[PDB]
Design a protein around this ligand. Structure first.
Ligand SMILES: CCCCCCCCCCCCCCCC(=O)N[C@@H](CCO)C(=O)O
Ligand SMILES: CCCCCCCCCCCCCCCC(=O)N[C@@H](CCO)C(=O)O
Lengths: 454, 454
């Protein structure tokens, strides 16, 4: 039985002021570097324990001992995402119902069905970059957000955000980013009902209204339609849970649309941005990935099977998720009194935070070179110990979109590597913007066309 | 020998305050309706005479008697267009030099060479409209400006404005519209050096700077690439005048690029916008034009020969130019003392304004039904009397871009009518915005895809 380390305190505010930063996850990573595999984090009225080692996280991921918790971040996101899949408790009827109804939308058959629509948006990205004039640059996270939002909109809902027709952000994206930024900024507030935050509350409610206006349109467009889609929205509106025999109700469907639009693009745009960052910073890796893209993508547009054959591109994406997992933490609660790691007694209800970027830097798992970008770590994924690589969370509450996101990202990165040479013309200094999720900010490159037609 | 009518005066300001309107051409048309084929227009320090009848305009179009004048509008535009083709005097060396160098850029061989690049931009417009969601509308003049600017940029200069990648105007367009608007607004100013206009002068100089920054880039991009292109810019940079044996100088080339970018898209965007307006207001005419497009455009993209075959679409465009010629006036001066129409003595140097929309409503030429949209007026072209139809001006100073504009507009309207049904869903009330040039403002439609693939 050991005493846990704890970072510096601020009297009655305990550790809460450590979150007074626009980069809280990066601040918690530096605390983990200083304190090691576990530290206690106290705020007025609550406590959590941040885990960073595979040794402890393998126990936290035991579903007999621990269940998904709503972190403070997810309790704030639930103000607009409700009992959608991401912000529901495992014990809420609508979690297992929606899980059973929507999992078929991510089957191999469903994925083959989304492929043509993913290609539609990927081709729009390639055409945009082919059409740039001499010495014009690419705003990477901006174009990756255009691609990923359009992809989940079209594949999921047969709705065109038409992000490549806009030089300004879509109103949905402005409102979504401001809602996530507010949830993050609320983490540091000792007194969230201080009238100082009344303007924040008004702006938050307006941003929720903008997101719900978009959901209204997606639903109306579908119920009107004389087409026959068989997509994610078809399953939301028509699917029956085999267990209860019930379909989703209208209120829950609205929460699922909001959930899948946000979760289904924010994280994937981050991944593609980080992957391109690591490729331009590691030219031998870029060359190996470009050689694979040239060898495999022999047709004007990629087939489903060709994307499955881009092994090295997949390894690049996994290595980007290792260093900068774009949903960088998840929360658990103890189902019963238990002892963690033979050293740390927990009571029923006690909360843990898994700090995924730190798990992914565990030298006992990955070796001393953890900061190096080396896709070859994923040559045989079976070599990775249980619960060592967790960019998609854990168990029955793991990411439903994992295969969707990796297919989209592999297709798009494959086409990018086939069609262009890339230049880090500014020698960009990585700057990671936090909105609960992680993404490079201000990342620009130049693309030189290889002049290969579509 | 007759005395000319004159509209209402404002004491020492004479007729100048009649131009204190954002719709001066439409105001002059209403004056012509009241006063007839000729009226005197006086301002402090000058006089011109507005002509509205074919009887008088056929004499004004005699190049032995009258030469092109710079109107006050063109003298203000010359502040940025210099001695480019539009704002040069016929007797300036650089007019005939540039005319001889650039005329071959509008040959049939040149037009066949521009066709593929016109199709590139037209396909971008069709894809934009195919990608709209249920019950979304089209902003017609906004999308026609996107198309026409992109077309002259790509065909003329191998430069991509990428207007379909923007929901906000290109900086060039904002600056160009504001410079034309300032030229129009300056027409009414009795005291242009009043300090009240100091902000107008600063903004005008800034807008000239933005336009010249774009010209810098177009030239640099070309001189860097080498040649490879054989387009309008190739002739500007390399062509020699067969008469003098001289190429254009650097200063004149810059003025020609500004001239062709402005003239080469503002007028054409207005034509396409008015043509679509008249088609949705005249459904029998829309059906005839749509039937021709379906019958002729049998391939995924139109050929040069197929566009030459769209006779009825061409008649629609000519009938839109009859009612709303988008460069709606041109100015002449008397080369010598002469008598106009046996009734109006003029002295050498005396100025005339041809009010083209009024010429085009001359009932003695067209019949009593001049306000009706009837493309069949153009079914037997030789039947149009000499100098009755002047949307491209007159003689050696006629529009150099006439064939380019009508090819672009016939291709684009043909593809629009092939791919979509149109609905005037707001029962739009025509509102004509003036910036020297004419274009509908606030014109919106709904397009229903015919689901014909590209
Ligand atoms: C609607 C679906 C999309 C939801 C957005 C995805 C969010 C994914 C990441 C959420 C965790 C971010 C970690 C924030 C840093 C942190 O450690 N927070 C703790 C602070 C201690 O209270 C907490 O929220 O308690
Ligand atoms: C650089 C290439 C683009 C040039 C801009 C195209 C301009 C087309 C001109 C259209 C006619 C403008 C008529 C304005 C109304 C008018 O009648 N103005 C008189 C007023 C009397 O002085 C004048 O300008 O004296």
């Amino acid at each position: 039985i050991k005493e846990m380390p704890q970072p510096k305190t601020f009297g009655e505010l305990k550790n809460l002021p450590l979150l007074n930063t626009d980069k809280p996850v990066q601040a918690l990573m530096k605390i983990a570097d200083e304190l090691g595999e576990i530290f206690k984090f106290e705020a007025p009225g609550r406590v959590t324990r941040y885990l960073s080692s595979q040794r402890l996280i393998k126990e936290a991921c035991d579903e007999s001992r621990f269940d998904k918790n709503l972190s403070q971040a997810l309790k704030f996101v639930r103000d607009f995402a409700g009992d959608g899949l991401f912000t529901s408790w495992t014990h809420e009827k609508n979690w297992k119902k929606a899980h059973n109804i929507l999992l078929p939308s991510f089957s191999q058959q469903a994925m083959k069905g989304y492929h043509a629509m993913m290609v539609d948006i990927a081709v729009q990205l390639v055409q945009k970059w082919e059409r740039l004039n001499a010495d014009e640059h690419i705003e990477v996270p901006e174009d990756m957000t255009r691609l990923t939002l359009d992809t989940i909109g079209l594949c999921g809902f047969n709705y065109r955000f038409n992000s490549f027709y806009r030089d300004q952000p879509h109103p949905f994206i402005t409102s979504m980013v401001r809602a996530l930024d507010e949830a993050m900024n609320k983490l540091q507030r000792a007194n969230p009902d201080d009238p100082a935050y009344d303007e924040n509350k008004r702006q938050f409610q307006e941003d929720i209204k903008v997101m719900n206006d978009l959901v209204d349109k997606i639903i109306a467009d579908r119920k009107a339609s004389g087409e026959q889609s068989d997509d994610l929205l078809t399953h939301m509106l028509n699917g029956k849970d085999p267990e209860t025999g019930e379909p989703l109700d209208d209120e829950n469907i609205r929460y699922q649309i909001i959930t899948f639009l946000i979760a289904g693009h924010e994280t994937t745009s981050g991944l593609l941005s980080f992957a391109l960052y690591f490729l331009v910073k590691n030219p031998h890796v870029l060359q190996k990935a470009a050689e694979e893209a040239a060898r495999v993508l022999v047709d004007p547009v990629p087939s489903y099977k060709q994307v499955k054959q881009l092994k090295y591109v997949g390894m690049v994406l996994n290595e980007a998720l290792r260093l900068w997992p774009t949903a960088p933490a998840f929360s658990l609660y103890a189902k019963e009194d238990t002892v963690l790691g033979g050293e740390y007694p927990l009571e029923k209800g006690d909360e843990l935070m898994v700090l995924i970027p730190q798990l992914h830097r565990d030298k006992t798992i990955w070796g001393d070179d953890v900061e190096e970008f080396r896709p070859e770590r994923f040559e045989n994924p079976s070599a990775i110990p249980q619960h060592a690589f967790k960019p998609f969370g854990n168990g029955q509450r793991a990411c439903i979109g994992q295969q969707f996101a990796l297919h989209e990202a592999t297709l798009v990165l494959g086409m990018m590597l086939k069609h262009f040479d890339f230049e880090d013309h500014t020698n960009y200094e990585l700057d990671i913007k936090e909105t609960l999720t992680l993404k490079p900010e201000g990342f620009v490159v130049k693309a030189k066309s290889k002049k290969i037609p579509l």
